[PDB]
Amino acid sequence: MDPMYLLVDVGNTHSVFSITEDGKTFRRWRLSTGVFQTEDELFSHLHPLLGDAMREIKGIGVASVVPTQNTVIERFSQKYFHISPIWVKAKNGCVKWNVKNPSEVGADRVANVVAFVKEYGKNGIIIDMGTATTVDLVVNGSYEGGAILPGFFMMVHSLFRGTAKLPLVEVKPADFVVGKDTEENIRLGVVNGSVYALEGIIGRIKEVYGDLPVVLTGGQSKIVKDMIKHEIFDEDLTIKGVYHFCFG
Amino acid sequence: MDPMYLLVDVGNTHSVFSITEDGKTFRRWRLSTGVFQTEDELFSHLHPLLGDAMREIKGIGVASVVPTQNTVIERFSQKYFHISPIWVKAKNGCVKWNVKNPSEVGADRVANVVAFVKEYGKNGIIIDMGTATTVDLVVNGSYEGGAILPGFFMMVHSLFRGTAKLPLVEVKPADFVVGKDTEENIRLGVVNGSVYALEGIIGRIKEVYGDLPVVLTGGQSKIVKDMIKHEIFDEDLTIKGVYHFCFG
């Protein structure tokens, strides 16, 4: 048998729900995380999406960076599936967590590192382009740390909100050397500039640690895929990590 | 005679007030821009700061990126000094505004270009690290355009506000290749990452237009000058532009 698993990645903005019966093929959906969402509301949203699959679920695993949502997921699991979910957390084992406080690292990044070591080997740099844009370094199966910067949407929104005159710009790479209107100026600074920022952090990493392979993932990674030199593109890295952590 | 001029730079978070008698040396104060401030409230704030000098003011020049503040400045000038202010604007003259809508470029950036062309030459790249971080290009006396990204504080605050878990971090450069705690991750991504962003944008400008001199300016520019290659560091660039535009 190939038991069906529900894997959940709870983000600040969006939550990913995915089912697998093997841990290699994932069907996935995405919902807004919302505020004050309830377990019945969650069930109601998932019902026409999962269809008949809903009744086959045998385990629920979750990585969450939104502690407020966690009792909702717990309640959903118990009411609808009569099980408690398994929660992604940094713990001792095959990944060494070489940072000041491993329990402080977001469950999403933990999950990425778990999936990495499990599928891609012992040495790597993970770029997760999501709500935040995250860089994470794995050396010899030890998590060594990383960098955080605002994600693309976070940046354009910040300029729109933090300013009287700037518009909210659609995230799209610039193909010019300087922008000729406001929208172009922001595409160039936020999109192309964040790509330069990443290329720069990776560069300094590689000077100290070698020539590690780079995996790209995240909700916002598809738009700039080509622009960053990478060995692996894997949109399912986080959900793979939940799967491996919880269900091995 | 050496008439005293008040120069004003109205920004989204702060407004700079400076006095000069020569346009070569400036005394400056900074205040929050606030919301719903009145001309009497402005006078009240400036009164103990400007002191005796307030009586000597013969002209007021203003660059503003906050249109709702402008009527307040107009009324302040007329009530307390019986003059209308002079407003910095892109217009034909010593600078050619070679972009789609010159009237849409921020008055702060207009003033930076005016000061640069008047003070430093016909060819250059201006980096202004403030609310936003701006890049502007001038080639043979022609403003060619630029880039806009969130400023340092805007970035750290966007992470704090847009996230359940991330702290609000103090801006300070990273002296390390990867961060080992949340605060370090953010410093590396926002501060060092923004430096990389700027270097990559400038690099690409340089490839096309040659080795242009770079000026650094702005209220968040101190901490990072030792990280960017620049030929001119001038914290008074915008106020100088205001002076040159309005008072010659």
Q: Rounded to an integer, what distance in angstroms lies between the CA atom of residue A75 and that of residue A58?
A: 16
Distances (CA, A) of A79 to A18, A35, A37, B80: 19, 20, 15, 70
A191 touching B (Cβ < 8 Å):
no
Q: Which of residues 121-140 of B touch A (CB under 8 A)?
A: 131-135, 137
Residue with the two structure tokens 């809903």: A54
Chain B residues lying within 8 Å of A178, measured CB to CB: 135, 137, 144-147, 205
Cβ <8 Å between A196 and B200: yes
A198 to chain B: closest CA residue? B193
A147 touching B (Cβ < 8 Å):
yes
Of the candidates B65, B162, B190, which has its C-beta nearest A131's C-beta?
B162
Q: Rounded to an integer, what distance in angstroms lies between the CA atom of residue B154 and that of residue A25?
A: 40
Kindly give the residue spans of alpha helices, DSSP state H, lying in B82-218.
107-119, 152-161, 182-186, 193-209
Q: Using CB atoms within 10 Å of the CB of residue A173, give its burial: 0 to 12 exposed, 13 to 18 middle, 19+ buried.
A: middle
Of the candidates A67, A159, A184, which has its C-beta nearest B150's C-beta?
A159
The helix/strand/coil state of B233 is strand
Is A12 marked within a binding site? Answer: yes
B101 touching A (Cβ < 8 Å):
yes
Q: Rounded to an integer, what distance in angstroms lies between the CA atom of residue B110 and that of residue B95?
A: 9
In total, the C-beta contacts within 8 angstroms joining chain A to chain B are 202
One-character DSSP codes across A109-160: HHHHHHHHHHHT-S-EEEEEESSEEEEEEEETTEEEEEEEEE-HHHHHHHHH
A125 to chain B: closest CA residue? B178
Q: What are the CB-based long-range contacts (under 8 Å, 24+) for B162-166?
A: B162/A12, B162/A13, B162/A131, B162/A132, B162/A150, B162/A154, B162/A157, B163/A12, B163/A65, B163/A131, B163/A132, B164/A12, B164/A65, B164/A66, B164/A67, B164/A68, B165/A65, B165/A66, B165/A67, B165/A106, B166/A132, B166/A148
Chain A residues lying within 8 Å of B34, measured CB to CB: none
CA distance B226 to chain A (A): 17
Task: Give the resolution value in Å.
Answer: 2.0
How was this one solved?
A: X-ray
A177 touching B (Cβ < 8 Å):
yes
Cβ <8 Å between A189 and B201: yes
Is B133 marked within a binding site? Answer: no
Q: How much of chain A is helix, strand and coil, in % rounded to 5?
A: 40, 25, 35
Q: What is the CATH number of domain A1-122+235-248?
A: 3.30.420.40
Q: How many helices (H) and strands (E) does chain B have?
A: 7, 11
**Equal fold, B1-122+235-248 vs B123-234:** yes
Q: Which of residues 4-63 of A touch B (CB under 8 A)?
A: 12-13
CA distance A155 to chain B (A): 6
Nearest to B189 by CA among A155, A177, A60: A155
Cβ <8 Å between B65 and A188: no
Q: Rounded to an integer, what distance in angstroms lies between the CA atom of residue A193 and that of residue A204?
A: 17
Q: How many CB atoms lie within 10 A of CB A30?
A: 14
Is B131 marked within a binding site? Answer: yes
Inter-residue contact A66 to A13 (CB < 8 Å): no
Buried-state track B214-241, b at ≥16 Cβ within 10 A, e below 16 = bbbbbbbbeebeeebebebebbbbbbbb
In this structure, which amino acid lies at residue B196? Y
**The total number of residues written for chain B in this structure:** 248
Cβ <8 Å between B200 and A192: yes
Of the candidates A147, A157, A185, which has its C-beta nearest B185's C-beta?
A147
Q: What sign for the dihedral angle of Cα B118, B232, A197, A176?
A: positive
**Which of the residues A2, A108, A181, A234 is marked catalytic?**
A108
CA distance B105 to chain A (A): 7
Inter-residue contact B90 to B105 (CB < 8 Å): yes
A70 touching B (Cβ < 8 Å):
no
Nearest to B45 by CA among B14, B5, B74: B14
Cβ <8 Å between B189 and A209: no
Q: Rounded to an integer, what distance in angstroms lies between the CA atom of residue A25 and that of residue B88?
A: 60
CA distance A84 to chain B (A): 23
Full strand arrangement of the beta sheet holding B27-32: B27-32, B14-20, B4-10, B57-64, B86-87
Is B11 marked within a binding site? Answer: yes
Cβ <8 Å between A188 and B132: no
Inter-residue contact B90 to B103 (CB < 8 Å): yes
A167 touching B (Cβ < 8 Å):
no
Chain B residues lying within 8 Å of A184, measured CB to CB: 145
Residue A186's DSSP bridge partners are: none
In CATH, what is the architecture of B123-234?
A: 2-Layer Sandwich (3.30)
A175 touching B (Cβ < 8 Å):
no
Is B190 marked within a binding site? Answer: no
Cβ <8 Å between B197 and A194: yes
Q: Rounded to an integer, what distance in angstroms lies between the CA atom of residue A188 and that of residue A182?
A: 10
Is B109 marked within a binding site? Answer: yes
Domains of chain B, residue spans? 1-122+235-248, 123-234
